[PDB]
């Protein structure tokens with residue numbers, strides 16, 4: 069069970085923090101007395117956030133700005149950021165490439181770019197951060213979407229990348245348990261959330277309800293802090309049990325007794 | 332209810348065809364009297380697949396050698412093979428890059444290559460193949476795994492890439508149902524198969540048993556020709572119902588309705 073002080077003094081990277089969910093993640097961590105390095109492309113907007121973060125109780129608040137389409141920038145960024153903070157407790161992977169909701173028409177360069185931005189970078193950031201996460205016994209929050217467990221018409225490129233996140237990071241969870249690595253990995257499954265970029269992108273296309281950016285941020289923090297395997301905030305109490313696949317839990321358990329562990 | 336004559340003088344691409352499951356697919360389409368174009372990297376092991384499909388009943392059998400790590404080659408490939416056969420009915424996407432069995436501990440290169448070979452290429456070949464298949468009302472077989480539905484330790488980069496296929500090709504399908512695009516996409520989820528590569532790699536590590544190549548290939552052909560959404564060949568009768576996910580199924584449908592189709 070959660071208390072705010074499980075974040076006070078903790079060092080933390082929020083990505084996609086220049087607006088929406090990511091912006092609020094950063095704010096609440098700052099009400100908690102956390103140190104943050106926040107990141108995104110748009111410098112102005114990032115200063116606007118560090119400043120408010122300091123105005124609300126963060127221990128420190130720096131920003132670094134760059135495109136995550138850029139793997140060296142991902143690598144380097146992680147290092148500056150640890151160095152700024154004396155290390156790292158929790159890595160919040162929250163950014164994404166912007167996509168319109170249309171039928172797919174052959175746009176390969178879109179499938180590719182969305183794969184870089186929403187999957188490859190997550191893994192590099194993760195790989196750069198791992199030494200300090202290991203020493204800290206810390207945590208990585210992998211922000212994803214109902215569209216990373218099922219599929220909606222209009223976002224094939226997006227969903228491919230979010231599906232890949234489950235597959236890669238879930239396997240990483242399971243290796244870490246077996247090897248007694250105490251870096252937790254919380255896959256965060258978000259129903260629609262009322263960010264401007266997602267109101268603007270769905271008006272007159274998707275009709276379902278939208279849950280609030282502020283709580284969505286918070287719940288991400290909470291489930292990451294509690295070392296939850298998964299954190300569903302999809303606007304319902306029932307629906308997580310229809311997205312989370314008991315079939316798969318059962319299968320993963322059984323299948324594990326089919327390895328020669330000793331070897 | 333399937334029959335072999337449904338492939339009589341059908342024009343089929345087979346990737347990953349120089350051995351393994353994909354050779355065995357080619358060999359079976361030959362007995363049935365299809366036109367086949369097979370690709371892989373290895374020119375010698377392809378000249379051997381073609382003589383054999385010739386001596387078997389192939390209406391026609393050709394090869395192109397080339398690496399599916401190169402997307403110009405995937406693209407040109409599909410046009411070279413379409414000119415040859417005078418059309419395209421079925422596109423079978425079977426190649427993959429197998430990696431080192433190992434705990435993940437930083438190897439991004441692999442994570443990049445696996446995604447190139449296994450996923451991106453299935454996309455480029457598909458987009459390139461699309462007009463010939465809209466014009467035949469033909470079929471794609473995307474060949475994946477158990478470890479594209481659930482995770483398994485020691486293979487995260489490959490899992491990521493099989494999962495992505497699920498999210499991209501399952502979205503594209505549902506987009507075809509809507510636009511009444513009459514091209515079917517069959518996801519093939521297969522457990523272990525006794526190709527040398529799988530067994531050699533798992534020798535000593537994974538102790539569960541492996542179903543045969545020969546009928547794995549056949550089942551693939553069958554479920555793709557019967558234009559099925561999924562096809563399971565996983566060593567038991569009950570396992571498909573643990574992997575194929577009634578939670579997801581149900582949400583895929585109920586959400587068809589929260590969209591504004593007029594727009």
Ligand SMILES: NC(=O)c1ccc[n+]([C@@H]2O[C@H](COP(=O)([O-])OP(=O)(O)OC[C@H]3O[C@@H](n4cnc5c(N)ncnc54)[C@H](OP(=O)(O)O)[C@@H]3O)[C@@H](O)[C@H]2O)c1
Pocket residue numbers: 083084085086087088089090107108109110113134135136137161162163164165166185211212213214258259260261262263264265266
């Ligand atoms: N909103 C929803 O309904 C919803 C639902 C499910 C999942 N999610 C997920 O939640 C995460 C955040 O969603 P959101 O609604 O907050 O998005 P959003 O409000 O548009 O904000 C996304 C943030 O990520 C950043 N980002 C975009 N491109 C970037 C790039 N190339 N490099 C670095 N950062 C980039 C943006 O800043 P810059 O543009 O300045 O770089 C912005 O900071 C995403 O992972 C998304 O998939 C959202």
Ligand SMILES: NC(=O)c1ccc[n+]([C@@H]2O[C@H](COP(=O)([O-])OP(=O)(O)OC[C@H]3O[C@@H](n4cnc5c(N)ncnc54)[C@H](OP(=O)(O)O)[C@@H]3O)[C@@H](O)[C@H]2O)c1
Pocket residue numbers: 346347348349350351352353370371372373376397398399400424425426427428429448474475476477521522523524525526527528529530
């Ligand atoms: N066998 C199993 O246990 C099992 C279980 C589940 C899923 N599957 C799946 O089934 C499919 C086939 O499995 P497998 O055991 O048959 O494969 P295999 O015996 O490893 O066959 C791999 C084929 O793909 C080719 N290939 C590898 N890299 C290539 C590249 N860069 N360009 C072109 N071709 C490349 C190979 O020829 P070259 O080296 O000459 O190019 C070879 O023909 C895969 O998609 C896999 O994920 C297999």
Ligand SMILES: CCN(CC)C(=O)Cc1cccc(NS(=O)(=O)c2cccc(Cl)c2C)n1
Pocket residue numbers: 164165166167168169213214215216220223226258259260261265266269274276
């Ligand atoms: C879709 C990419 N994007 C900007 C377009 C993001 O901001 C990410 C995003 C926006 C909206 C929803 C979403 N994921 S989601 O909730 O599973 C989703 C995706 C598509 C449709 C719907 Cl209704 C829902 C709920 N992800």
